[PDB]
Amino acid sequence: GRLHSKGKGISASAIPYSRNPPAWLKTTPEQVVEQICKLARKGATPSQIGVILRDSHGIAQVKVVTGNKILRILKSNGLAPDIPEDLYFLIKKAVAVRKHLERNRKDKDSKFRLILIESRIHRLARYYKTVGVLPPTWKYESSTASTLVA
Amino acid sequence: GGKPRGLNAARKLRNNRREQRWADLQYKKRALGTAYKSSPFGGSSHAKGIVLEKVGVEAKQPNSAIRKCVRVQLIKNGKKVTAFVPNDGCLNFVDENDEVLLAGFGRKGKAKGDIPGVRFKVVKVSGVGLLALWKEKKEKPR
């Protein structure tokens, strides 16, 4: 029911039964791409760009109007990041707790909690390599993990 | 309940059976071969021995009697055991130094009835057999 917990949740998002853009939008696909690229240039990430595009003006679901996904669009325009978002975000958590442990040496629970993050990181990295997204020698040395972040 | 059931999982089923097989008592005594090493009889059915003395054995609680046992030393190994004469008034047919033949009680190691701790019984004496003397169909050699 959940990877690393004892509880189950079903707070998902239901996708409508309509593969046609609402008529009132009346927006062409050609103009859609530039604003997406605009936010990526200012420094945003594919996940968060969608919520502004959805909230601020018009398109609820990019796929129907465009025919392709945000990452697919970005990859063909050479703005795709080197390391996939899911792997990147996890690392950001692991580094911060490490800094906490060196000052607070008696925080036993976080030591247990820390075990979870890289175990998730290791499990996710294995899949990326066997499909061909990551080079087959990437290893995530716990020492230099900071360099990977930036 | 709790077995492995997959199609490519014959190895686990074989391993568990061979391991859990040892908790059985009947099978385990055969594999280790304790009877051959330990039992006074080296896996055989009968044996011959020489008589040392005659002893009386007291019965257990509900009964009360003297069970009239005998002391024997085997020729194969030279160990000494106790044997139950199994008839009525036969202690007048066995004397000292008479080279008797022994069998078991048919309980496969444990003691039968009330006699506290004897696992064998005399079948022959001077090669004549007990029942022959009892029904006076023969005579002992002189």
């Binding site: 039964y17 593969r19 | 059931r5 997959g6 199609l7």
Partner: protein
């Protein structure tokens, strides 16, 4: 997690028959279940079944006509010879004169008493009577 949708569907059907209802829902759709339902339907053990549709796995709804008993499934896909079928029909069937074991062959998902006629064999999936 879900590992045998065919077993899940059959289990739901059995509950209704022993409780006496006339309707069951089936959440995951697949060719194997839908063809499995047809083999009973050609013998009358079930009634009319409706397939809904959405861009997803897809639900199914059939209404139970009664006159149906235990219908199970064998989870480990065994290998059956054409000679070792009398063993299986002796194994799990109330009687010889009726009941059906269902196989999968290269000629399609089908049952015995015709596999004997067509001289075919394959793997076992279930049974119903």
């Amino acid at each position: 997690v879900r590992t045998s949708v065919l077993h899940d569907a059959l289990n739901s059907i059995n509950n209704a028959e022993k409780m006496g209802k006339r309707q069951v829902m089936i959440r995951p759709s697949s060719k194997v279940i839908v063809k499995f339902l047809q083999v009973m339907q050609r013998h009358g053990y079930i009634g009319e079944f409706e397939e809904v549709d959405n861009h997803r796995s897809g639900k199914i709804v059939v209404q139970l006509n009664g006159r149906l008993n235990k219908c199970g499934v064998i989870s480990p896909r065994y290998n059956v010879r054409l000679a070792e079928l009398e063993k299986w029909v002796t194994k799990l069937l109330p009687a010889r004169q009726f009941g059906y074991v269902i196989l999968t062959t290269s000629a399609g998902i089908m049952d015995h008493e015709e596999a004997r006629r067509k001289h075919v064999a394959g793997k076992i999936i279930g049974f119903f009577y």
